[PDB]
PDB file of C-alpha atoms and ligand atoms in Angstrom:
ATOM      1  CA  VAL A   1      60.101 -44.044  90.591  1.00 39.69           C
ATOM      2  CA  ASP A   2      61.373 -41.962  93.748  1.00 38.16           C
ATOM      3  CA  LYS A   3      64.595 -40.580  91.869  1.00 39.63           C
ATOM      4  CA  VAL A   4      67.835 -40.479  94.829  1.00 41.41           C
ATOM      5  CA  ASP A   5      68.942 -37.016  95.790  1.00 40.39           C
ATOM      6  CA  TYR A   6      70.898 -37.937  98.879  1.00 43.02           C
ATOM      7  CA  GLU A   7      71.390 -41.383 100.614  1.00 42.88           C
ATOM      8  CA  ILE A   8      73.427 -41.775 103.922  1.00 41.66           C
ATOM      9  CA  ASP A   9      72.977 -45.572 104.381  1.00 41.34           C
ATOM     10  CA  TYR A  10      74.786 -46.607 107.779  1.00 40.89           C
ATOM     11  CA  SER A  11      74.944 -50.214 106.928  1.00 41.67           C
ATOM     12  CA  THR A  12      77.998 -49.425 105.826  1.00 41.96           C
ATOM     13  CA  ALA A  13      78.812 -45.363 106.441  1.00 44.48           C
ATOM     14  CA  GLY A  14      80.112 -44.680 110.339  1.00 45.25           C
ATOM     15  CA  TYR A  15      78.797 -41.915 112.204  1.00 46.11           C
ATOM     16  CA  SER A  16      79.830 -38.321 112.210  1.00 40.37           C
ATOM     17  CA  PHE A  17      76.826 -35.752 112.607  1.00 39.77           C
ATOM     18  CA  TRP A  18      75.858 -33.409 114.370  1.00 35.63           C
ATOM     19  CA  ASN A  19      74.056 -34.212 118.413  1.00 33.84           C
ATOM     20  CA  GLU A  20      73.463 -33.296 121.874  1.00 28.39           C
ATOM     21  CA  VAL A  21      72.090 -34.813 124.940  1.00 27.48           C
ATOM     22  CA  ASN A  22      71.369 -32.804 127.621  1.00 27.81           C
ATOM     23  CA  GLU A  23      73.787 -33.039 130.355  1.00 27.07           C
ATOM     24  CA  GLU A  24      70.225 -34.964 132.201  1.00 23.49           C
ATOM     25  CA  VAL A  25      70.346 -37.731 130.835  1.00 19.85           C
ATOM     26  CA  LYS A  26      73.842 -38.171 129.407  1.00 19.17           C
ATOM     27  CA  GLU A  27      75.248 -41.439 132.022  1.00 19.84           C
ATOM     28  CA  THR A  28      71.911 -43.287 130.247  1.00 21.59           C
ATOM     29  CA  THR A  29      71.993 -42.356 126.859  1.00 20.51           C
ATOM     30  CA  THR A  30      74.496 -43.570 124.394  1.00 24.82           C
ATOM     31  CA  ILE A  31      74.265 -42.058 119.993  1.00 25.75           C
ATOM     32  CA  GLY A  32      76.593 -44.028 116.954  1.00 30.32           C
ATOM     33  CA  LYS A  33      77.444 -46.980 115.343  1.00 26.79           C
ATOM     34  CA  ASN A  34      76.365 -50.809 116.168  1.00 27.31           C
ATOM     35  CA  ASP A  35      78.379 -52.383 113.635  1.00 27.23           C
ATOM     36  CA  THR A  36      76.680 -55.923 113.724  1.00 24.97           C
ATOM     37  CA  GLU A  37      73.580 -54.717 113.299  1.00 23.37           C
ATOM     38  CA  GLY A  38      75.200 -52.238 110.347  1.00 26.61           C
ATOM     39  CA  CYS A  39      72.632 -49.061 111.945  1.00 25.64           C
ATOM     40  CA  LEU A  40      72.706 -45.563 113.596  1.00 23.44           C
ATOM     41  CA  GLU A  41      71.773 -47.044 116.905  1.00 23.46           C
ATOM     42  CA  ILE A  42      69.696 -44.445 120.280  1.00 26.86           C
ATOM     43  CA  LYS A  43      70.273 -46.320 123.207  1.00 26.79           C
ATOM     44  CA  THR A  44      68.439 -45.268 126.527  1.00 26.53           C
ATOM     45  CA  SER A  45      67.602 -46.945 130.053  1.00 24.43           C
ATOM     46  CA  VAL A  46      65.878 -42.855 131.276  1.00 24.90           C
ATOM     47  CA  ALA A  47      63.497 -40.824 129.887  1.00 25.04           C
ATOM     48  CA  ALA A  48      64.506 -37.231 129.307  1.00 22.84           C
ATOM     49  CA  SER A  49      62.178 -34.419 130.114  1.00 24.81           C
ATOM     50  CA  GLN A  50      62.050 -33.473 127.008  1.00 26.11           C
ATOM     51  CA  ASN A  51      62.216 -34.400 123.883  1.00 26.20           C
ATOM     52  CA  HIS A  52      64.549 -32.355 122.333  1.00 26.26           C
ATOM     53  CA  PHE A  53      67.140 -33.088 125.522  1.00 26.54           C
ATOM     54  CA  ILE A  54      68.136 -35.954 122.813  1.00 29.07           C
ATOM     55  CA  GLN A  55      68.984 -34.760 119.647  1.00 28.23           C
ATOM     56  CA  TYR A  56      70.594 -35.784 116.542  1.00 26.77           C
ATOM     57  CA  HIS A  57      71.138 -35.696 112.909  1.00 25.94           C
ATOM     58  CA  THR A  58      70.268 -38.532 110.910  1.00 23.09           C
ATOM     59  CA  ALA A  59      71.541 -36.622 107.981  1.00 24.33           C
ATOM     60  CA  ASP A  60      73.273 -33.475 106.661  1.00 23.98           C
ATOM     61  CA  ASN A  61      73.909 -31.166 104.113  1.00 20.32           C
ATOM     62  CA  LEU A  62      70.427 -32.224 102.028  1.00 20.47           C
ATOM     63  CA  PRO A  63      70.549 -30.877  98.345  1.00 20.19           C
ATOM     64  CA  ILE A  64      66.605 -29.807  98.717  1.00 18.42           C
ATOM     65  CA  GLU A  65      65.483 -26.285  97.296  1.00 13.62           C
ATOM     66  CA  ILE A  66      62.493 -24.486  98.963  1.00 13.94           C
ATOM     67  CA  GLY A  67      59.692 -24.846  97.644  1.00 11.68           C
ATOM     68  CA  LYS A  68      60.174 -27.969  95.828  1.00 11.50           C
ATOM     69  CA  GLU A  69      58.277 -31.413  96.913  1.00  8.91           C
ATOM     70  CA  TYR A  70      60.139 -34.384  98.059  1.00  8.22           C
ATOM     71  CA  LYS A  71      60.260 -37.319 101.012  1.00  4.91           C
ATOM     72  CA  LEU A  72      62.207 -37.981 103.523  1.00  6.88           C
ATOM     73  CA  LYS A  73      62.506 -42.163 104.064  1.00 10.98           C
ATOM     74  CA  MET A  74      64.029 -43.440 106.556  1.00 12.97           C
ATOM     75  CA  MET A  75      64.206 -47.316 107.596  1.00 13.05           C
ATOM     76  CA  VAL A  76      63.848 -47.319 111.578  1.00 14.75           C
ATOM     77  CA  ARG A  77      62.919 -50.348 114.518  1.00 16.38           C
ATOM     78  CA  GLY A  78      63.224 -50.079 118.174  1.00 19.25           C
ATOM     79  CA  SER A  79      63.030 -52.228 120.836  1.00 15.70           C
ATOM     80  CA  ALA A  80      59.393 -51.300 121.875  1.00 13.77           C
ATOM     81  CA  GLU A  81      56.925 -49.594 120.196  1.00 14.12           C
ATOM     82  CA  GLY A  82      57.738 -45.789 120.185  1.00 12.05           C
ATOM     83  CA  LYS A  83      57.611 -42.346 118.635  1.00 11.00           C
ATOM     84  CA  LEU A  84      60.536 -40.326 116.528  1.00 11.40           C
ATOM     85  CA  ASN A  85      60.079 -37.209 115.705  1.00 12.43           C
ATOM     86  CA  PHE A  86      62.195 -34.990 112.765  1.00 12.89           C
ATOM     87  CA  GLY A  87      62.194 -31.996 110.785  1.00 13.32           C
ATOM     88  CA  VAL A  88      63.788 -31.118 107.522  1.00 13.68           C
ATOM     89  CA  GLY A  89      65.467 -28.475 107.400  1.00 12.33           C
ATOM     90  CA  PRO A  90      68.311 -26.061 108.608  1.00 11.68           C
ATOM     91  CA  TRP A  91      68.387 -24.830 111.942  1.00 12.62           C
ATOM     92  CA  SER A  92      66.252 -21.618 111.060  1.00 11.23           C
ATOM     93  CA  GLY A  93      63.093 -23.831 110.149  1.00 12.76           C
ATOM     94  CA  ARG A  94      62.136 -27.234 108.562  1.00 13.48           C
ATOM     95  CA  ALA A  95      59.548 -29.309 107.540  1.00 12.92           C
ATOM     96  CA  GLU A  96      57.756 -31.888 110.595  1.00  8.93           C
ATOM     97  CA  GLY A  97      56.899 -34.606 110.977  1.00  6.88           C
ATOM     98  CA  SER A  98      57.081 -38.102 113.397  1.00  6.44           C
ATOM     99  CA  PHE A  99      57.098 -41.359 112.705  1.00  3.48           C
ATOM    100  CA  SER A 100      55.714 -44.578 115.327  1.00  3.31           C
ATOM    101  CA  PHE A 101      58.059 -46.939 114.715  1.00  2.00           C
ATOM    102  CA  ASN A 102      57.879 -50.776 116.252  1.00  2.00           C
ATOM    103  CA  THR A 103      60.082 -53.469 116.101  1.00  2.00           C
ATOM    104  CA  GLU A 104      60.130 -54.839 112.751  1.00  2.00           C
ATOM    105  CA  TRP A 105      62.435 -53.309 110.353  1.00  2.00           C
ATOM    106  CA  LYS A 106      60.423 -50.997 108.348  1.00  2.00           C
ATOM    107  CA  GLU A 107      60.573 -47.711 105.550  1.00  2.00           C
ATOM    108  CA  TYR A 108      59.199 -45.106 107.023  1.00  2.00           C
ATOM    109  CA  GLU A 109      58.614 -41.514 104.645  1.00  2.00           C
ATOM    110  CA  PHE A 110      57.269 -38.263 104.983  1.00  2.00           C
ATOM    111  CA  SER A 111      55.950 -36.362 101.721  1.00  2.21           C
ATOM    112  CA  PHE A 112      57.050 -32.649 102.295  1.00  2.00           C
ATOM    113  CA  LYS A 113      57.169 -29.047 100.591  1.00  2.00           C
ATOM    114  CA  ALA A 114      60.877 -27.762 101.675  1.00  2.00           C
ATOM    115  CA  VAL A 115      60.568 -25.331 103.010  1.00  2.00           C
ATOM    116  CA  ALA A 116      64.778 -23.133 103.496  1.00  2.00           C
ATOM    117  CA  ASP A 117      66.966 -24.088 101.013  1.00  2.00           C
ATOM    118  CA  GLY A 118      69.054 -27.225 102.710  1.00  2.00           C
ATOM    119  CA  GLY A 119      70.143 -28.574 106.073  1.00  2.00           C
ATOM    120  CA  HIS A 120      69.451 -31.216 107.669  1.00  2.00           C
ATOM    121  CA  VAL A 121      67.300 -34.076 109.471  1.00  2.00           C
ATOM    122  CA  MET A 122      67.207 -32.832 112.928  1.00  2.00           C
ATOM    123  CA  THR A 123      65.708 -36.182 114.880  1.00  2.00           C
ATOM    124  CA  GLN A 124      64.462 -36.211 118.193  1.00  2.00           C
ATOM    125  CA  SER A 125      63.605 -38.685 120.665  1.00  2.00           C
ATOM    126  CA  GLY A 126      64.342 -38.101 124.224  1.00  2.00           C
ATOM    127  CA  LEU A 127      61.309 -39.243 125.807  1.00  2.00           C
ATOM    128  CA  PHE A 128      61.760 -43.096 124.573  1.00  2.00           C
ATOM    129  CA  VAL A 129      63.189 -45.698 126.868  1.00  2.00           C
ATOM    130  CA  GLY A 130      65.531 -48.545 124.599  1.00  2.00           C
ATOM    131  CA  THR A 131      66.881 -48.810 121.266  1.00  2.00           C
ATOM    132  CA  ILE A 132      66.665 -46.977 118.214  1.00  2.00           C
ATOM    133  CA  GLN A 133      67.876 -48.118 115.265  1.00  2.00           C
ATOM    134  CA  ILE A 134      68.269 -46.388 111.961  1.00  2.00           C
ATOM    135  CA  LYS A 135      69.456 -47.866 108.500  1.00  2.00           C
ATOM    136  CA  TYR A 136      69.563 -45.194 106.073  1.00  2.00           C
ATOM    137  CA  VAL A 137      68.247 -42.081 105.533  1.00  2.00           C
ATOM    138  CA  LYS A 138      67.058 -40.605 101.993  1.00  2.00           C
ATOM    139  CA  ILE A 139      65.632 -37.614  99.814  1.00  2.00           C
ATOM    140  CA  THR A 140      63.335 -38.549  97.177  1.00  2.00           C
ATOM    141  CA  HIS A 141      61.766 -36.901  94.248  1.00  2.00           C
ATOM    142  CA  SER A 142      59.129 -38.475  91.750  1.00  2.00           C
TER     143      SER A 142
HETATM  144  O1  LIG B 201      63.887 -28.712 119.775  1.00  2.00           O
HETATM  145  C1  LIG B 201      64.606 -27.588 119.380  1.00  2.00           C
HETATM  146  C2  LIG B 201      66.500 -27.760 119.481  1.00  2.00           C
HETATM  147  O2  LIG B 201      66.778 -28.292 118.934  1.00  2.00           O
HETATM  148  C3  LIG B 201      66.980 -26.461 120.019  1.00  2.00           C
HETATM  149  O3  LIG B 201      67.969 -27.299 120.316  1.00  2.00           O
HETATM  150  C4  LIG B 201      69.496 -26.461 120.258  1.00  2.00           C
HETATM  151  C5  LIG B 201      69.534 -25.976 118.519  1.00  2.00           C
HETATM  152  O4  LIG B 201      70.150 -25.199 118.391  1.00  2.00           O
HETATM  153  C6  LIG B 201      71.767 -25.705 118.820  1.00  2.00           C
HETATM  154  O5  LIG B 201      72.875 -24.869 118.227  1.00  2.00           O
HETATM  155  C7  LIG B 201      73.243 -24.388 116.855  1.00  2.00           C
HETATM  156  C8  LIG B 201      74.494 -25.280 116.861  1.00  2.00           C
HETATM  157  O6  LIG B 201      74.543 -25.132 115.254  1.00  2.00           O
HETATM  158  C9  LIG B 201      75.276 -24.150 114.906  1.00  2.00           C
HETATM  159  O7  LIG B 201      75.494 -24.559 113.678  1.00  2.00           O
HETATM  160  C10 LIG B 201      73.353 -23.599 114.871  1.00  2.00           C
HETATM  161  O8  LIG B 201      73.437 -22.085 114.740  1.00  2.00           O
HETATM  162  C11 LIG B 201      73.586 -22.965 116.703  1.00  2.00           C
HETATM  163  O9  LIG B 201      71.441 -22.707 116.681  1.00  2.00           O
HETATM  164  C12 LIG B 201      71.660 -26.242 120.062  1.00  2.00           C
HETATM  165  O10 LIG B 201      72.829 -25.998 120.942  1.00  2.00           O
HETATM  166  C13 LIG B 201      70.823 -26.953 120.473  1.00  2.00           C
HETATM  167  O11 LIG B 201      71.053 -26.881 122.006  1.00  2.00           O
HETATM  168  O12 LIG B 201      66.276 -26.142 121.342  1.00  2.00           O
HETATM  169  C14 LIG B 201      65.353 -25.652 121.642  1.00  2.00           C
HETATM  170  C15 LIG B 201      64.237 -26.820 121.593  1.00  2.00           C
HETATM  171  O13 LIG B 201      62.784 -26.372 120.926  1.00  2.00           O
END
């Protein structure tokens, strides 16, 4: 069993986490809740010049300890095929990876050793044009 250390479930939760849309793409980007689908939604009509120019925490206050093994689980879809970059950890340093999403609601998992104590799920998608939807984020261990 993947025992759940942490969950944020956007099926019901609102969104209050840190996010930063670079001024380059401020007019054409939105980050917030879609209360009909029941998900976090990141919508873009213009690609940014850098992927980190649309960056947002999808989870925070994580109960992770340096050197322990976990999984990050995220349920994601998009309006077209694309890539979500992430890191799990504090601002000093993270365990990094990416998910390649499609138009179906699917769960993605990333196994990692924590590189630090605590932190957040930094998520970046500035190069993606369209709609990204995120249903939940979990941290688990075996
Ligand atoms: O991918 C990298 C980006 O994530 C990075 O963005 C900056 C990251 O630091 C942010 O500032 C933090 C704000 O919260 C405080 O508590 C922290 O101490 C600050 O460091 C800043 O707002 C982001 O622009 O830019 C570099 C990219 O490689």
